[PDB]
C-alpha cells in the first residue's frame, strides 16, 4: 500500500527532524482496518517555542509531493498527495499533549502500539497507557433518551420544512436524522463501540433486517420521495423505540411517536 | 397561528417574571419569514445571582404544557409543545448578554425591533443597535478556497468509502458535500446571504439550472444511484470553480478536479 510508505516517511522524518518531539498515529492502520481506500493521520507534536511558525507546507512536502493542503474545520492541516492519498496531520505543541487523555470517549481503543510512531521524552507512551482499553459504555438510558429525543426534534422540524416546500432543507434534516437512526440502531443491536463514527462498517455490522429499514429511510431531491423516506423513518424509529424501552426509562414515549405519525398528513 | 399564540405568552411571562431581565427573539418571526410550519425560537437573560438554579422546566411548562423537553448539542433547551408547535429556548446570564454582538457572523440581520421581546433595563436594545441592518459579506477568496479544499477533502474521502463497499457512510458524506456545494453555488450566483442556512428558501434563491444539477448530486441508499451522485457531485463543482476562477485565485485548479474524477474508475 501507498499509505504504508507514506506512513514510513511520516516515521523517519518525525524521528530525525529536531523540531518534532512527538507523532501519534490514529485512525484505521491502527485498528487493522486499513486498506487501499484508506487515508493517513496524525498528531504531530512539536517543540513549544517553534509552534507557531513551524513550516507545516514545506514539511508535509518532504513526506511526499501534494496536489492540495488546507487547513480543517478542526485545525488539522488536510493534504492530498500527488498519488491522491489523504493525510490528515494535526500540529500542536508538546505542552498540548494532554489532550490525549479526553481521547478516551471517542470509541473503543483495544490496543494503544500501533499509535506510537516516535516519542522523544516517553511522554507520549505514558498518555497512551492512560487510554489503552477505553471503551465508552453507549448503552445507557441517558443516551437512548437524547436519540429518542433529538430524532423527535429533528423529524418535527424536517417534516414541517418538507410540508412547506423546501425539499432541499428537509433532505438536509433527513441526512441529520439518518446519523442518529443508526445510533439508535447500534444501541437496539448492542453493538455500538462504533458510535460517533456510527457508519463505518456498517454493512459489516448490523443486521439485514435493520439494514434494509434503514435503506428505507434514504431519498433523493423528490418530494414523493421525501415523504416516504420521513415516513419510514419515523416507522423504523417507533420499531427501535418498542425495543428499547424494554430496556430503559424513556421519555419520548410511543404515545409521542404516534402523534408525530398522525401529523404527516395534518 | 399557535405560534403567535406562543410568542405572546413568551412576552407576557418575559416582562412579568422579576427573574427575568431580557428576552430576545430570533429567527423566521424576526426576518418575515415566519408561518405555519416554523418554530419560535428566544434567548432568555436572567438576574445573575439566579441564573444557577434557574429550572427551566418549570417556567417553560408555564409558556404552555410540552410533551418533549431536553438540551440539544449546542445546549439549547428544545420544546415540543403538546400542541406539536417546537420551541428552542436558550437561558443566560443578563451578564452573557454581550454574546449578542458576535451574532452578526451568523447572517444577515433585517429587522431588531422585532427580536426585541423584553428589555428592562434597555440594554438589549442598545445590543442589537449595534447588528441591525448588518451582514457579512460571504462573496470572499478565503470562502471560495476553504469551500472548494473541504469539497474536495470531502469529495475523495468519500469516494473512497464508496468503492470499498462503505455505503451508508458514503451517503452521510454525499450530505456533507451537498451542503458545502449549496455554498458554491450561492458564492457562483451571487446570493449567499443564506450561508450557513444554506438550504434555507433554497427553491426560491437559486436558478432553475443549478437547483436541476443539485438535485443529481443526491441519492438513495444504493450503489449505482451514489456512484451516480458522487459523479454529478464533482461535475457540479468543476461547473461552479470555472466561473470562480473568474474572481478569485483558487488551490483547488480544473486539473486538480480532473483527477478527481479520473480517480472514480481507478
Ligand atoms: N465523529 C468522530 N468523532 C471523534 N472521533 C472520530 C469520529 N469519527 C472518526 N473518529 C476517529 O478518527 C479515526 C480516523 O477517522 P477517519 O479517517 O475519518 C475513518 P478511519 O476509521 O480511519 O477509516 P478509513 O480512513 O480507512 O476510511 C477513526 O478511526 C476514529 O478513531
Ligand atoms: N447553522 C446556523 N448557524 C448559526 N445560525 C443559524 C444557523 N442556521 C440558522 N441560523 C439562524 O437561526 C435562525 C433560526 O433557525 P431555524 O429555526 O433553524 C430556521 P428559521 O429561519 O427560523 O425558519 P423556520 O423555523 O420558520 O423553518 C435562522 O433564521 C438564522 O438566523
Ligand atoms: C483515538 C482517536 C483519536 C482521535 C483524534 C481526535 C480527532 O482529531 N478527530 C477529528 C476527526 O475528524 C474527522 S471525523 C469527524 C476525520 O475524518 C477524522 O480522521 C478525525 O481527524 C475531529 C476533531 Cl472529530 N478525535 C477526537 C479522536
Ligand atoms: C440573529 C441570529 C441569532 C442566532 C442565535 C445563535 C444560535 O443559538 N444558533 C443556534 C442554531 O442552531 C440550530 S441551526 C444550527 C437551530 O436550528 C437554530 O434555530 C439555532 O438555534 C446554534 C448555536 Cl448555531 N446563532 C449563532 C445566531
Ligand atoms: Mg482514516
Ligand atoms: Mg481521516
Ligand atoms: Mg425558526
Ligand atoms: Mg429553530
Ligand atoms: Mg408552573
Same mark, same amino acid.
Given at each position: 500500500?501507498?499509505?504504508?510508505?507514506?506512513?514510513?516517511?511520516?516515521? #523517519? !522524518?518525525?524521528? /530525525?527532524?529536531? *523540531?518534532? &518531539?512527538?507523532?501519534?498515529?490514529?485512525? /484505521?492502520?491502527? $485498528?487493522?482496518?486499513?486498506?487501499?481506500?484508506?487515508?493517513?493521520?496524525?498528531?504531530?507534536?512539536?517543540?513549544?517555542?517553534?509552534?507557531? #511558525?513551524?513550516?507545516?507546507? #514545506?514539511?508535509?512536502?518532504?513526506?511526499? @509531493?501534494?496536489?492540495? +493542503?488546507?487547513?480543517?474545520?478542526?485545525?488539522?492541516?488536510?493534504?492530498?498527495?500527488?498519488?491522491?492519498? *489523504?493525510?490528515?496531520?494535526?500540529?500542536?505543541?508538546?505542552?498540548?499533549?494532554?489532550?490525549? @487523555?479526553?481521547?478516551?470517549?471517542?470509541?473503543?481503543? @483495544?490496543?494503544?502500539?500501533?499509535?506510537?510512531?516516535?516519542?522523544?521524552?516517553?511522554?507520549?507512551?505514558?498518555?497512551?497507557?492512560?487510554?489503552?482499553? =477505553? *471503551? @465508552?459504555?453507549?448503552? &445507557?438510558?441517558?443516551? =437512548?433518551?437524547?436519540?429518542?429525543?433529538?430524532?423527535?426534534?429533528?423529524?418535527?422540524?424536517?417534516?414541517?420544512? +418538507?410540508?412547506?416546500?423546501?425539499?432541499?432543507?428537509? !433532505?438536509?434534516?433527513?441526512?441529520?436524522?439518518?446519523?442518529?437512526?443508526?445510533?439508535?440502531?447500534?444501541? =437496539?443491536?448492542?453493538?455500538?463501540?462504533?458510535?460517533?463514527?456510527?457508519?463505518? #462498517? !456498517?454493512?459489516?455490522?448490523?443486521?439485514?433486517?435493520?439494514? $434494509?429499514?434503514?435503506?428505507?429511510?434514504? =431519498?433523493? +431531491?423528490? $418530494?414523493?420521495? !421525501?415523504?416516504?423516506?420521513? $415516513?419510514? /423513518?419515523?416507522?423504523?424509529?417507533?420499531? +427501535?423505540?418498542?425495543?428499547?424501552?424494554?430496556?430503559?426509562?424513556?421519555?419520548?414515549?410511543?404515545?409521542?411517536?404516534?402523534?408525530?405519525?398522525?401529523?404527516?398528513?395534518?
Amino acid at each position: 500500500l501507498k499509505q504504508k510508505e507514506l506512513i514510513a516517511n511520516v516515521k #523517519n !522524518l518525525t524521528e /530525525s527532524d529536531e *523540531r518534532i &518531539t512527538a507523532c501519534m498515529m490514529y485512525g /484505521s492502520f491502527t $485498528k487493522g482496518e486499513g486498506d487501499q481506500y484508506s487515508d493517513i493521520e496524525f498528531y504531530i507534536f512539536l517543540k513549544h517555542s517553534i509552534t507557531s #511558525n513551524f513550516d507545516s507546507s #514545506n514539511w508535509l512536502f518532504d513526506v511526499a @509531493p501534494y496536489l492540495m +493542503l488546507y487547513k480543517n474545520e478542526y485545525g488539522t492541516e488536510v493534504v492530498i498527495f500527488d498519488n491522491l492519498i *489523504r493525510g490528515e496531520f494535526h500540529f500542536l505543541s508538546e505542552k498540548d499533549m494532554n489532550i490525549i @487523555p479526553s481521547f478516551k470517549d471517542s470509541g473503543y481503543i @483495544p490496543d494503544t502500539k500501533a499509535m506510537l510512531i516516535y516519542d522523544e521524552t516517553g511522554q507520549l507512551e505514558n498518555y497512551l497507557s492512560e487510554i489503552s482499553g =477505553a *471503551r @465508552p459504555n453507549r448503552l &445507557t438510558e441517558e443516551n =437512548a433518551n437524547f436519540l429518542l429525543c433529538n430524532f423527535s426534534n429533528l423529524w418535527l422540524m424536517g417534516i414541517n420544512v +418538507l410540508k412547506r416546500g423546501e425539499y432541499a432543507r428537509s !433532505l438536509e434534516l433527513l441526512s441529520q436524522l439518518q446519523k442518529n437512526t443508526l445510533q439508535l440502531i447500534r444501541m =437496539a443491536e448492542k453493538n455500538a463501540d462504533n458510535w460517533l463514527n456510527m457508519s463505518k #462498517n !456498517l454493512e459489516k455490522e448490523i443486521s439485514l433486517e435493520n439494514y $434494509k429499514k434503514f435503506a428505507k429511510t434514504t =431519498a433523493r +431531491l423528490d $418530494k414523493v420521495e !421525501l415523504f416516504e423516506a420521513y $415516513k419510514n /423513518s419515523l416507522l423504523l424509529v417507533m420499531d +427501535l423505540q418498542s425495543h428499547l424501552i424494554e430496556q430503559y426509562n424513556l421519555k419520548v414515549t410511543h404515545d409521542i411517536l404516534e402523534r408525530l405519525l398522525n401529523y404527516i398528513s395534518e
